[PDB]
Amino acid sequence: DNSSYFPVGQGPEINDMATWNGRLWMTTGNVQYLDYSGAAIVEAVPPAGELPVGKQIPLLAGENAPIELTNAATTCVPRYSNDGRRIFTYLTTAQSVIPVQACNRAANLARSCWLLSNVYAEPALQALGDEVEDAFDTLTNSSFLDVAKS
Amino acid sequence: PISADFSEVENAPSFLSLAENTDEVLKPYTGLEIQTIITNIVGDANPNQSRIFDQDRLRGNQYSAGGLVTQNAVSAIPFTNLIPRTIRVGNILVNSANRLQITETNVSEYYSNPIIATKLSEMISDQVKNNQFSTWRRDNTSLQGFNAFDIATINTAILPNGLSLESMLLKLSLLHSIKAMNVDAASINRSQYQVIDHNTVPTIGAPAVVGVNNSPVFGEDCGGNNPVYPFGGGTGAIAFHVTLQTVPDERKSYAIFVPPAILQATSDANEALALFALSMSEWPHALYTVTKQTTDLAGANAGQQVFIPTQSTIHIGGRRVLDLIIPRREIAPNPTTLVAANAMCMVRPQAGPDATAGAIPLAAGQLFNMNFIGAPAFEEWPMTSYLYSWAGRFDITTIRQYMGRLATMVGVKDAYWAAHELNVALSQVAPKMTTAAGGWAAQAANSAQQSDVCYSSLLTVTRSAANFPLANQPAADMRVYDTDPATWNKVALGLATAANLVPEQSMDVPFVVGDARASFWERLQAIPMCIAWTMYYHSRGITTLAWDNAYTDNTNKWLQKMVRNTFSTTQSVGTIIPARYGKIVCNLYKNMFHRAPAYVATSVGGKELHITHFERWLPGGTYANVYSGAGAVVNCFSPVLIPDIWCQYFTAKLPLFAGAFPPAQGQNSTKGFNSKQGLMIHRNQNNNLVAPYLEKFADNSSYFPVGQGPEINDMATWNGRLWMTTGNVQYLDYSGAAIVEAVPPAGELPVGKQIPLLAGENAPIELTNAATTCVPRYSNDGRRIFTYLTTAQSVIPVQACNRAANLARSCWLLSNVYAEPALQALGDEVEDAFDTLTNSSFLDVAKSVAESAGEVPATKALTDLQAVDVSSLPSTSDPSNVLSQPAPLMSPPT
Amino acid sequence: PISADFSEVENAPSFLSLAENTDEVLKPYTGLEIQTIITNIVGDANPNQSRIFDQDRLRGNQYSAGGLVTQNAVSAIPFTNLIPRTIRVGNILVNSANRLQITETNVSEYYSNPIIATKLSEMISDQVKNNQFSTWRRDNTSLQGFNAFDIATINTAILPNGLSLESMLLKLSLLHSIKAMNVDAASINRSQYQVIDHNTVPTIGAPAVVGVNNSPVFGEDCGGNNPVYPFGGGTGAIAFHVTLQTVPDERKSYAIFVPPAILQATSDANEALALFALSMSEWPHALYTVTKQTTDLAGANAGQQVFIPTQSTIHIGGRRVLDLIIPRREIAPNPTTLVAANAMCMVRPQAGPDATAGAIPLAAGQLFNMNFIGAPAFEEWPMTSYLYSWAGRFDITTIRQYMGRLATMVGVKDAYWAAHELNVALSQVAPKMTTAAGGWAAQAANSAQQSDVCYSSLLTVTRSAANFPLANQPAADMRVYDTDPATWNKVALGLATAANLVPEQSMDVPFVVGDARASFWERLQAIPMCIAWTMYYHSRGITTLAWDNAYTDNTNKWLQKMVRNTFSTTQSVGTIIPARYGKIVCNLYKNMFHRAPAYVATSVGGKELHITHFERWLPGGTYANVYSGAGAVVNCFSPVLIPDIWCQYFTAKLPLFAGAFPPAQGQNSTKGFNSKQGLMIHRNQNNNLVAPYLEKFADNSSYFPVGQGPEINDMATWNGRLWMTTGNVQYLDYSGAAIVEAVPPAGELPVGKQIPLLAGENAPIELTNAATTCVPRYSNDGRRIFTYLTTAQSVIPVQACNRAANLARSCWLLSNVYAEPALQALGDEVEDAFDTLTNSSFLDVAKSVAES
């Protein structure tokens, strides 16, 4: 509310939730990137409603291309302009009603997702080197173990 | 609320639980409960900054029965007050083919809070009695610029009833409701112009223009520049008097004083006089008009549409002619000469800034020629023309200050709020529904069906049958209190007081009275009213044709009772008594919204009872019914006005039979009640008709026994909704015979009104915008009605009642929230720094005035000393007391 | 107080601290001690004239922002009561082209302090009860001169209402302030004849003459020889009676007894009678006209010139016809023949020396033929004619005698003082300021803008729209109580008394009356009133349109409540209830001057309530607005009338946002408040717009939330003054777009009125003679207003607020303010030896000042 321009010596601060809301405004198909007053910023802007999206490669039989925003970047929410202005994500009023109620927990916004569950393994190897005992490694174990240290 | 799972609908409250008497205190319904859900504005905002021109719809995502999701789906706000007099047709705007709506009121005297004479009156009587020792006719009794012989006659023969002020406050609120259209287009809903005309589009840039007597068709202009009353067809008369003597004998009893306390502003006071005169003559004095620029759906063709406010067509009967008795500027001998009079009138009345024709023509700004004894001739003006001239000059902001001074004389908070409740109840209005399979429909342009409309109570609004002025009066729709000139004269001069009349501060005036948002806010206050009346009529199954003929019929004794008890037609001890089953709807309201309706007291023998607007309607009207897609009427349903998403998304708590169908979640979808609930399936001689699990009494009543009708049972009603919501129900007799009532083309249900879409919106799908709860059960001739399905159609739903199968349904994708009340006071107000700098002084001076009603610094102990013979002063032998009701004791047998 | 250093700015009181209620009883602020501020001024260029004719002006040395010095620069006293009716144009007298100003009043009943019966009236009523026939015999009379049947009939009434004397004393104060003008020319300062007309130079040699009905234009003469009421027209009526038996019924209850105490109050009883008759009829009875010889600025074009006093235009009372009852010389039954009537009365009423021509002409000094019981035809005089005869003989020392007698019969000490306050508050008047970049300006000669004027309350005066007599819809400016004839009759006969009617020693009459300096003291007493209203209006930044439209259609919620509590909206019966926010203005007055306004007690609900002229104004006026050169109206600023130095220099304490800028070129020159003070800048550099450090926004950044307006914050107002006092301020909104109010041509600020200079004086330089504190914050639209400078222009002031730079601004060299050298070759701080030798004495003076 109190910084169309950031004060010198200061810039935007970490705040996850406002960034989340910025992503919600962005992920609607029709955001507008503008000044505190609603003026255009100096930075070049995408053709309306577009977001950066991942690289195409040829398909194998049975594959499908990714749909909608399933292969896009979303988190890149601008806030600090080149000349020191804030950047705001705007929507027109009528476009604005469902998302605001979604922040108020009285409405829901549709989105796409991957249908993938979570797994994260304990580390596969301690050493940083692969190695397996052969039978001969066990036949000739102790001698190696002390000659090594020696 | 919306239900998330079948577990929630299965645990919803029973109807009888919500209709119980509730004893707790509750806050007024300000209409901001709905605002924080359908709008950007949570918390405060400036109306200019918010663009509530686009905040005029219910919006959300919808889920289909087939598994698709429709984003940005939409629904109209059902209610309105504007009536088009020029409809768009074929993209080209044209004159209306249909006559205007009308409404009637039954105004009358009733006992109010008990009334008592003040100290100032005792002092006056002692002044007279003391004056009787001297052969001098003297003027000790003058007050506030009035003649001593007038204060004497205003101090005589008080009326027990009490004082109301209600009809006054109605006329003021209706006027305000009309002038609130005059504000800029940015803060009136777009939809409000297109509830009835769905083919027009208003333009944001230009404000609406409020005129008078401009209408093109059916003689709606009431003589135009030369005016007459719209209903009586007559012309009034008004006369101003310095003193009561110049009033002709035919009407010295009807004279009203105009107290000096109004007109104390340095703001033009000649207008405040006109607005005092307007609030006591007959209403409407003319047909107001709202002209607004609009355009074609393609944006292509532009024009000026004409509208009639619903407030401007409701008839509050009263007084054609007025004698207004003006205060004197300087205490003086009565002005036998004219120059003594005019230079001594506290205000000298003159016509407002508009010309008028006909007999007694009035040039703009013309001055009234004062009446005084020995004048060459009597003078008066037609009042329709005198009011025609000021008609363009009132505005919201001046009504606010007017009522702000009016509050200082008499408390006006709770009374005004109740009058505003009557305002909303009689003026907000919605079009009849069209049956369909899908989510939208509307009647053909400029048809009779397009313009047919109903009240929040599910009663239809009557139409005129001939060109204005109307030759003949319509039946009364609702009954209101009247304001006596006599006890008005007593109360304005401090001579009398009652517990409801205690003076209040100018800040106590409720927020709607000032704001430009007020039109939108009135529009939002009528929804809970329909939700209450809807749950009422839908708890029982009685059909529209059956309510329509009920008051008289001799087929069934129960039905006659069921209608006779919903209207206010009873009395005792000379006062009105509230309708017996209106209290059910009131309780139903309090329990669902957790808010209290505004009420007013009636004194039955000194015992106060509360009347609400739920309890004061009168018999005569037709009940609300849907039309076919072709325009044919449909009788079979119970009365309906609005889609059930409104009923079920805006209540804190709800009846079980009316809950939303739960969202699909993995295996589960929707489910039905069975014999484990006490229900049982109906079967007949036919082997290809199946009816749901129903009551066990359903087995033993093809006809209801006389003295008895269908009973509340949520679960059977739920099953009836499950049979109905399949696309192919059949409405039939116990035997499978056709019922007499007209039925919809097969598989169709009533559905909400279409309006034009904004970019990015989608139309509602399937049954997302339909009414569902209107399940018929009681036929016009006394038969039950059954919902049937063929056997093969019947198998999945029955298993769904048995919890062994699931039924697909559509729903809104909306979560539940319901706020604690936004404001306690009923008035907005914020401390400024200066309010805190000057706090305590105001706090005690206020209380020192509230107790000061009818007080003067001189007390009886002082004015006794000046008296000749103190024992014979009436204040000594008659200490004053509050009058009892119906009347004070007289001639006791010792 | 003006400031020598910026240290004196930071340590100044906050506004809320002075708006706080104070308990201690204080003293009246008479113009006799305001007198000593104009005289006893610092300066070596100043000849200290002794005549009050020359002591009319604020003289002083001044110091430029560039560091030059200016000696004996001038600042005119703003107020006056004279409206010119013959403006000079082209250096010659020319008939005026502009209609006359008017004022009105809502007179009210006074139920406060209800009366008590005397034991005399008690025994009289007992005698009426027990039917004692003898006591009211036919020919019984008192030594008072009234017969007993009249007393027995006047006593029979019971009255709730008390007595006031407010409108009475007020009319006497008005006639006094008109008659004061006729005193020696040296006793009246010349600035007063050249506030509205800056091209006119009065002659000291010849006294102003006080005429009546001599005005040239717009029907002002009111018929000349045939006098008629200015307001509403018509003639009144007067009749003298020896008894209430003769007065026509339907007229009896209105007739006034005239006690012998009135008729022995002067050298000529007919004159005391005439003055009492003026005292309880309508005002003005005519339009009085001060005439004065004046000459050209070069002295080239002498002539008499006409002026209409402001006091003559206020309308009060207006009762039209009156019957007066008079004492009789002898104990005799009521007269039956005419000679038996004329010889009977204590004094036989007659016209004064001036003659009149009318349908009922009055020869000069004509005797009246007294009414009697058997009279064939009732006898009567025109009222305006009657008073017209005596209009030439009222005189301020005679009024002084009359006042000493009234003071003896009944109390007059306090009531006359409050009436005097109402007189000053209503009849003192200043022209609207013209905008400029420099020190002096005025509107073009003989123009509608030249004659626009405002009250001390910063409310514009109403102007008549048609020829006299007027026939208006009333537009009252403020309430007053009415003097009740019936209670006067109850008291004059000893039948009754009241708690404030206690008789006083004649020496206790307030010293203002009968003194020739009274006009000058009036002008002086007017200034502090403006200081309190000014500090009220300037604390919040509401524009002049937002006040002008605040009682009409264009209102808000907040403007609605805002105008509602400034004024006396409330109307309980028989009372005047004070404005809720008038109390704040009285608090400002008491804290900034350590003195108190006159009170009137008034009761509501048994609660006592003081009331002051601050609390009894009425809503619906138009506010002071600045003009552009060439006359265009501009209404962006909050309302103003007078230059800042008046405020800074008469006050003992002022709020922080109002102080004088410290002199240039010193260390601790003018600076500003920044982020630490809790403030934040609003940049808009994309459009070349940068604005000072301001209050942190509270959801009020571009539109104010409904029902709320800007908050008090001194430091932000100070910064706003710093932005304004640069030469190129720009009044825009949050986006940098234009606001609806009209705006000054760029760099202009309102500035004080020009008057001709005396020898050796200088025009004021730069911003020394200008309003500055009038900074906008709230527009009629409800939007915020911002004062912008371009990004380049805005860099030094931002460094100053940041306290890493100083700013250069002009100032008065008065009191302890000394000029600063360009170098500032500072040495070790050192107390001077003389300052230590004479320190205790300096403390003794200050202690003596604090004691008072």
PDB file of N, CA and C in Angstrom, chain B residues 123 130 136 138 140 144 261 264-267 329-333 395 397 401 506 829-830 832-833 835 838 848 857 866, chain C residues 109 111 153 156-160 250 252 254 317 476 479 540 551 553 555 560-561 564 571 573 580-581 584 607 619-620:
ATOM      1  N   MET B 123     -48.377  23.026  32.752  1.00  0.00           N
ATOM      2  CA  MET B 123     -48.112  24.435  32.945  1.00  0.00           C
ATOM      3  C   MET B 123     -49.118  25.238  32.151  1.00  0.00           C
ATOM      4  N   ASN B 130     -55.255  30.155  36.080  1.00  0.00           N
ATOM      5  CA  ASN B 130     -54.867  31.371  36.775  1.00  0.00           C
ATOM      6  C   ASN B 130     -55.355  32.584  36.034  1.00  0.00           C
ATOM      7  N   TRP B 136     -59.284  39.924  31.699  1.00  0.00           N
ATOM      8  CA  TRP B 136     -58.422  40.213  30.572  1.00  0.00           C
ATOM      9  C   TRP B 136     -58.320  38.973  29.695  1.00  0.00           C
ATOM     10  N   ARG B 138     -56.009  37.463  27.397  1.00  0.00           N
ATOM     11  CA  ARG B 138     -54.555  37.616  27.330  1.00  0.00           C
ATOM     12  C   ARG B 138     -53.877  36.382  26.727  1.00  0.00           C
ATOM     13  N   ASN B 140     -50.826  34.562  27.332  1.00  0.00           N
ATOM     14  CA  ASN B 140     -49.733  33.891  28.021  1.00  0.00           C
ATOM     15  C   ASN B 140     -49.352  32.538  27.420  1.00  0.00           C
ATOM     16  N   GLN B 144     -43.724  28.864  20.483  1.00  0.00           N
ATOM     17  CA  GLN B 144     -42.997  28.588  19.254  1.00  0.00           C
ATOM     18  C   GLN B 144     -43.586  29.293  18.039  1.00  0.00           C
ATOM     19  N   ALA B 261     -38.973  23.472  14.453  1.00  0.00           N
ATOM     20  CA  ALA B 261     -37.726  22.718  14.590  1.00  0.00           C
ATOM     21  C   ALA B 261     -37.216  22.156  13.262  1.00  0.00           C
ATOM     22  N   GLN B 264     -35.003  24.771  10.478  1.00  0.00           N
ATOM     23  CA  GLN B 264     -33.942  25.441  11.237  1.00  0.00           C
ATOM     24  C   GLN B 264     -32.607  25.515  10.499  1.00  0.00           C
ATOM     25  N   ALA B 265     -32.479  24.750   9.427  1.00  0.00           N
ATOM     26  CA  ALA B 265     -31.290  24.821   8.593  1.00  0.00           C
ATOM     27  C   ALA B 265     -31.298  26.112   7.787  1.00  0.00           C
ATOM     28  N   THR B 266     -30.113  26.595   7.431  1.00  0.00           N
ATOM     29  CA  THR B 266     -29.989  27.754   6.553  1.00  0.00           C
ATOM     30  C   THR B 266     -30.058  27.297   5.092  1.00  0.00           C
ATOM     31  N   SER B 267     -30.296  25.994   4.954  1.00  0.00           N
ATOM     32  CA  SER B 267     -30.517  25.340   3.679  1.00  0.00           C
ATOM     33  C   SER B 267     -31.911  25.739   3.284  1.00  0.00           C
ATOM     34  N   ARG B 329     -42.676  34.485  13.135  1.00  0.00           N
ATOM     35  CA  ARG B 329     -41.275  34.847  13.351  1.00  0.00           C
ATOM     36  C   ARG B 329     -41.032  35.622  14.636  1.00  0.00           C
ATOM     37  N   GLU B 330     -41.944  36.541  14.921  1.00  0.00           N
ATOM     38  CA  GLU B 330     -41.821  37.475  16.028  1.00  0.00           C
ATOM     39  C   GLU B 330     -43.094  37.353  16.842  1.00  0.00           C
ATOM     40  N   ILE B 331     -42.986  37.201  18.159  1.00  0.00           N
ATOM     41  CA  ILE B 331     -44.195  37.166  18.973  1.00  0.00           C
ATOM     42  C   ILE B 331     -44.905  38.505  18.845  1.00  0.00           C
ATOM     43  N   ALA B 332     -46.211  38.467  18.614  1.00  0.00           N
ATOM     44  CA  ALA B 332     -46.932  39.671  18.230  1.00  0.00           C
ATOM     45  C   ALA B 332     -48.442  39.472  18.263  1.00  0.00           C
ATOM     46  N   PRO B 333     -49.199  40.582  18.248  1.00  0.00           N
ATOM     47  CA  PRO B 333     -50.642  40.508  18.031  1.00  0.00           C
ATOM     48  C   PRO B 333     -50.941  39.943  16.651  1.00  0.00           C
ATOM     49  N   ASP B 395     -33.441  15.192  -3.230  1.00  0.00           N
ATOM     50  CA  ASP B 395     -32.377  14.235  -3.490  1.00  0.00           C
ATOM     51  C   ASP B 395     -31.944  13.563  -2.206  1.00  0.00           C
ATOM     52  N   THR B 397     -29.306  13.163  -0.404  1.00  0.00           N
ATOM     53  CA  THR B 397     -28.527  13.883   0.573  1.00  0.00           C
ATOM     54  C   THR B 397     -29.331  14.905   1.367  1.00  0.00           C
ATOM     55  N   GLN B 401     -30.570  14.845   5.714  1.00  0.00           N
ATOM     56  CA  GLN B 401     -30.485  15.921   6.699  1.00  0.00           C
ATOM     57  C   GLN B 401     -31.855  16.261   7.258  1.00  0.00           C
ATOM     58  N   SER B 506     -29.248  12.904  15.383  1.00  0.00           N
ATOM     59  CA  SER B 506     -29.257  12.886  13.927  1.00  0.00           C
ATOM     60  C   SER B 506     -28.369  11.795  13.339  1.00  0.00           C
ATOM     61  N   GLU B 829     -20.989   4.641  11.517  1.00  0.00           N
ATOM     62  CA  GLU B 829     -20.436   5.810  12.189  1.00  0.00           C
ATOM     63  C   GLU B 829     -19.004   5.515  12.620  1.00  0.00           C
ATOM     64  N   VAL B 830     -18.143   6.522  12.536  1.00  0.00           N
ATOM     65  CA  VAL B 830     -16.727   6.350  12.841  1.00  0.00           C
ATOM     66  C   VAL B 830     -16.243   7.571  13.603  1.00  0.00           C
ATOM     67  N   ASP B 832     -14.053  10.581  14.386  1.00  0.00           N
ATOM     68  CA  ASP B 832     -13.096  11.463  13.767  1.00  0.00           C
ATOM     69  C   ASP B 832     -12.244  11.908  14.941  1.00  0.00           C
ATOM     70  N   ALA B 833     -11.136  12.595  14.711  1.00  0.00           N
ATOM     71  CA  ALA B 833     -10.332  13.028  15.847  1.00  0.00           C
ATOM     72  C   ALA B 833     -11.114  13.997  16.729  1.00  0.00           C
ATOM     73  N   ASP B 835     -14.275  14.008  17.248  1.00  0.00           N
ATOM     74  CA  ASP B 835     -15.271  13.307  18.045  1.00  0.00           C
ATOM     75  C   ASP B 835     -14.670  12.867  19.360  1.00  0.00           C
ATOM     76  N   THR B 838     -14.010  16.005  21.682  1.00  0.00           N
ATOM     77  CA  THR B 838     -15.235  16.539  22.249  1.00  0.00           C
ATOM     78  C   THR B 838     -16.191  15.406  22.535  1.00  0.00           C
ATOM     79  N   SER B 848     -28.979  14.276  28.661  1.00  0.00           N
ATOM     80  CA  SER B 848     -29.701  15.354  29.309  1.00  0.00           C
ATOM     81  C   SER B 848     -30.805  15.885  28.414  1.00  0.00           C
ATOM     82  N   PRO B 857     -37.028  24.520  32.252  1.00  0.00           N
ATOM     83  CA  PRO B 857     -36.322  24.826  33.502  1.00  0.00           C
ATOM     84  C   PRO B 857     -37.230  25.304  34.641  1.00  0.00           C
ATOM     85  N   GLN B 866     -46.379  32.241  41.730  1.00  0.00           N
ATOM     86  CA  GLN B 866     -47.062  33.299  41.002  1.00  0.00           C
ATOM     87  C   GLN B 866     -48.575  33.122  40.980  1.00  0.00           C
TER      88      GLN B 866
ATOM     89  N   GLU C 109     -36.700  32.433  22.153  1.00  0.00           N
ATOM     90  CA  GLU C 109     -37.204  32.622  23.503  1.00  0.00           C
ATOM     91  C   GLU C 109     -36.198  32.169  24.539  1.00  0.00           C
ATOM     92  N   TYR C 111     -35.977  30.658  27.987  1.00  0.00           N
ATOM     93  CA  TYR C 111     -36.567  29.985  29.137  1.00  0.00           C
ATOM     94  C   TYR C 111     -35.597  29.745  30.282  1.00  0.00           C
ATOM     95  N   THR C 153     -53.566  43.759  37.737  1.00  0.00           N
ATOM     96  CA  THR C 153     -53.811  42.982  36.527  1.00  0.00           C
ATOM     97  C   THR C 153     -52.533  42.407  35.897  1.00  0.00           C
ATOM     98  N   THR C 156     -51.413  39.112  37.723  1.00  0.00           N
ATOM     99  CA  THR C 156     -52.268  37.932  37.724  1.00  0.00           C
ATOM    100  C   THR C 156     -51.753  36.799  36.839  1.00  0.00           C
ATOM    101  N   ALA C 157     -50.933  37.156  35.858  1.00  0.00           N
ATOM    102  CA  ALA C 157     -50.341  36.190  34.938  1.00  0.00           C
ATOM    103  C   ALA C 157     -49.243  35.354  35.590  1.00  0.00           C
ATOM    104  N   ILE C 158     -49.083  34.127  35.108  1.00  0.00           N
ATOM    105  CA  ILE C 158     -47.981  33.272  35.524  1.00  0.00           C
ATOM    106  C   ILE C 158     -47.076  33.088  34.315  1.00  0.00           C
ATOM    107  N   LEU C 159     -45.788  33.349  34.487  1.00  0.00           N
ATOM    108  CA  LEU C 159     -44.850  33.193  33.385  1.00  0.00           C
ATOM    109  C   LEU C 159     -43.763  32.177  33.699  1.00  0.00           C
ATOM    110  N   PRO C 160     -43.581  31.220  32.797  1.00  0.00           N
ATOM    111  CA  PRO C 160     -42.447  30.288  32.890  1.00  0.00           C
ATOM    112  C   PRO C 160     -41.081  30.909  32.556  1.00  0.00           C
ATOM    113  N   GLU C 250     -56.117  43.169  22.240  1.00  0.00           N
ATOM    114  CA  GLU C 250     -55.430  42.511  21.146  1.00  0.00           C
ATOM    115  C   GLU C 250     -54.119  43.268  20.976  1.00  0.00           C
ATOM    116  N   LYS C 252     -53.044  44.816  24.334  1.00  0.00           N
ATOM    117  CA  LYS C 252     -52.766  44.997  25.753  1.00  0.00           C
ATOM    118  C   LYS C 252     -51.606  44.148  26.246  1.00  0.00           C
ATOM    119  N   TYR C 254     -49.071  43.225  24.873  1.00  0.00           N
ATOM    120  CA  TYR C 254     -47.806  43.590  24.265  1.00  0.00           C
ATOM    121  C   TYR C 254     -47.237  44.888  24.822  1.00  0.00           C
ATOM    122  N   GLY C 317     -34.613  41.457  15.978  1.00  0.00           N
ATOM    123  CA  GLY C 317     -35.924  41.879  16.434  1.00  0.00           C
ATOM    124  C   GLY C 317     -36.864  42.020  15.257  1.00  0.00           C
ATOM    125  N   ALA C 476     -30.832  33.083   8.226  1.00  0.00           N
ATOM    126  CA  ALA C 476     -30.236  33.513   9.480  1.00  0.00           C
ATOM    127  C   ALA C 476     -28.790  33.098   9.602  1.00  0.00           C
ATOM    128  N   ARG C 479     -28.045  32.465  16.042  1.00  0.00           N
ATOM    129  CA  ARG C 479     -29.069  32.660  17.057  1.00  0.00           C
ATOM    130  C   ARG C 479     -28.732  33.680  18.133  1.00  0.00           C
ATOM    131  N   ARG C 540      -7.332  20.306   9.127  1.00  0.00           N
ATOM    132  CA  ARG C 540      -7.779  19.337   8.142  1.00  0.00           C
ATOM    133  C   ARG C 540      -7.817  20.027   6.793  1.00  0.00           C
ATOM    134  N   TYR C 551     -23.578  21.401   2.204  1.00  0.00           N
ATOM    135  CA  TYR C 551     -24.895  21.611   2.779  1.00  0.00           C
ATOM    136  C   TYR C 551     -25.919  21.647   1.650  1.00  0.00           C
ATOM    137  N   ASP C 553     -26.364  19.667  -2.533  1.00  0.00           N
ATOM    138  CA  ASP C 553     -26.420  18.323  -3.090  1.00  0.00           C
ATOM    139  C   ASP C 553     -25.099  17.548  -3.087  1.00  0.00           C
ATOM    140  N   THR C 555     -22.877  16.674  -1.398  1.00  0.00           N
ATOM    141  CA  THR C 555     -22.370  16.248  -0.107  1.00  0.00           C
ATOM    142  C   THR C 555     -21.879  14.815  -0.055  1.00  0.00           C
ATOM    143  N   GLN C 560     -21.168  15.693   5.484  1.00  0.00           N
ATOM    144  CA  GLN C 560     -22.491  15.878   6.053  1.00  0.00           C
ATOM    145  C   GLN C 560     -22.355  16.012   7.557  1.00  0.00           C
ATOM    146  N   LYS C 561     -21.678  15.045   8.178  1.00  0.00           N
ATOM    147  CA  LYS C 561     -21.473  15.103   9.620  1.00  0.00           C
ATOM    148  C   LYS C 561     -20.546  16.234   9.973  1.00  0.00           C
ATOM    149  N   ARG C 564     -22.362  19.348   9.949  1.00  0.00           N
ATOM    150  CA  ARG C 564     -23.416  19.228  10.946  1.00  0.00           C
ATOM    151  C   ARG C 564     -22.973  19.610  12.353  1.00  0.00           C
ATOM    152  N   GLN C 571     -32.097  22.194  17.808  1.00  0.00           N
ATOM    153  CA  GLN C 571     -33.151  23.120  18.182  1.00  0.00           C
ATOM    154  C   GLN C 571     -34.090  22.547  19.218  1.00  0.00           C
ATOM    155  N   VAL C 573     -36.586  23.480  22.410  1.00  0.00           N
ATOM    156  CA  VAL C 573     -37.460  24.614  22.679  1.00  0.00           C
ATOM    157  C   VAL C 573     -36.864  25.630  23.653  1.00  0.00           C
ATOM    158  N   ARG C 580     -21.281  20.888  18.597  1.00  0.00           N
ATOM    159  CA  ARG C 580     -20.390  19.930  19.224  1.00  0.00           C
ATOM    160  C   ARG C 580     -18.920  20.252  18.993  1.00  0.00           C
ATOM    161  N   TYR C 581     -18.582  20.749  17.808  1.00  0.00           N
ATOM    162  CA  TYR C 581     -17.189  21.055  17.523  1.00  0.00           C
ATOM    163  C   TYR C 581     -16.862  22.532  17.681  1.00  0.00           C
ATOM    164  N   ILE C 584     -14.165  22.821  20.490  1.00  0.00           N
ATOM    165  CA  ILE C 584     -12.765  22.679  20.123  1.00  0.00           C
ATOM    166  C   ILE C 584     -12.159  24.033  19.806  1.00  0.00           C
ATOM    167  N   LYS C 607     -29.286  20.300  32.999  1.00  0.00           N
ATOM    168  CA  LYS C 607     -27.846  20.409  32.813  1.00  0.00           C
ATOM    169  C   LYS C 607     -27.453  21.827  32.434  1.00  0.00           C
ATOM    170  N   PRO C 619     -25.518  27.063   9.868  1.00  0.00           N
ATOM    171  CA  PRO C 619     -25.052  26.469   8.598  1.00  0.00           C
ATOM    172  C   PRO C 619     -25.743  26.947   7.302  1.00  0.00           C
ATOM    173  N   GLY C 620     -25.084  26.738   6.158  1.00  0.00           N
ATOM    174  CA  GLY C 620     -25.551  27.212   4.857  1.00  0.00           C
ATOM    175  C   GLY C 620     -24.950  28.447   4.176  1.00  0.00           C
TER     176      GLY C 620
END
